[PDB]
Design a protein around this ligand. Structure first.
Ligand code: CA
Ligand code: CA
Ligand code: CA
Ligand code: CA
Lengths: 198, 198
């Protein structure tokens, strides 16, 4: 067993320490966040920080890193979409994180395709098999490191046919959702089992 | 494609809605949180909400659901361990979530084994292959649904030999870390690829 002390971790070069600490949370979700400004200019960003907050009411949280437009659009319009990345699109999803021209939509820049549904004024990713609209409820600034904790209410959900079981469970491996580890590693899930209420 | 509206989701029975909304974040990390009270009584809980907050300083966040002892111990002593669940121990990890006697340690109650390291006064899970000590920095109460957002600084990390690559990356599949989806589904990761800075 190897031991990395607090001092040893601080000694590491910035990028090495980044890969290392970002690996420590365990698996993370891979989601595309669809937004637009008030003039209808769209944006799309991959994030790995979507976190469940509750089912009643249905609340989802995410942490925004210390592009600017995704957070700015959310703050200005209060609307966004969350779209599962899947194995067919994880390369294009990853590409959204590149730095683009100020007015360059990551939808336009990549092979991903926007989609508007149910009068919701933020674009969905057409290629995503599980996605939902979200309305901003609260944002909390974390001064400890400059992150933003964005809290929103789930509105509408769209999911491939046959994916949602009668008890509400969705098999993420069956719809080919991908997971992330570290800053840049993508994985599919291989189901072990569902375990009953302990 | 199926569409579940806000109204449809609210119509679902509590447990069905729970499975459904908890599936929507995508994959989640599976971590055991080791704690003890001021008298040395230990506790252990599985959580699926550990989230990366930053690498400099190294901060990890977690959301505690709306057992009491894990949060109480953290608040009273300011110390806890975060331990990756792996394929060999996910059944026992799941069992920690059962309701136990007031003074019954989940270490004692399950096949998992406590371990103290480097003078840190919170127990580690011996069987975990990636684990770290954490010191409480901040806790924020979320009144929107009664959750607690617990923020701590990573102190010491312990990891199986050969797991940490020279660039800091840790292959979670190689150390057999497990992921969670929904409320009760466990998975291993099957690596697709690491992608370069876009
Ligand atoms: Ca050593
Ligand atoms: Ca496109
Ligand atoms: Ca329909
Ligand atoms: Ca035991």
């Amino acid at each position: 067993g190897m031991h990395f002390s607090k001092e040893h971790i601080n000694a590491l070069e910035t990028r090495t320490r980044a890969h290392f600490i970002n690996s420590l949370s365990g698996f993370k979700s891979a989601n595309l966040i669809g937004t637009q400004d008030r003039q209808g200019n769209t944006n799309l960003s991959i994030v790995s920080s979507v976190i469940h907050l509750g089912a009643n009411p249905p609340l989802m949280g995410m942490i925004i890193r210390p592009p600017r437009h995704t957070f700015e659009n959310i703050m200005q319009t209060g609307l966004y979409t969350i779209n599962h990345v899947n194995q067919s699109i994880y390369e294009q999803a990853h590409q959204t994180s590149a730095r683009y021209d100020k007015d360059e939509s990551e939808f336009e820049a990549t092979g991903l395709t926007p989609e508007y549904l149910s009068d919701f004024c933020a674009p969905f990713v057409k290629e995503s098999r599980l996605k939902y609209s979200v309305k901003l409820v609260e944002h909390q600034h974390l001064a400890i490191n400059g992150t933003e904790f964005v809290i929103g209410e789930i509105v509408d959900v769209y999911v491939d046919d046959n994916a949602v079981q009668t008890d509400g469970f969705i098999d993420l491996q069956a719809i080919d959702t991908v997971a992330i580890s570290g800053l840049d590693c993508y994985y599919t899930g291989d189901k072990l089992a569902r375990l009953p209420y302990a």
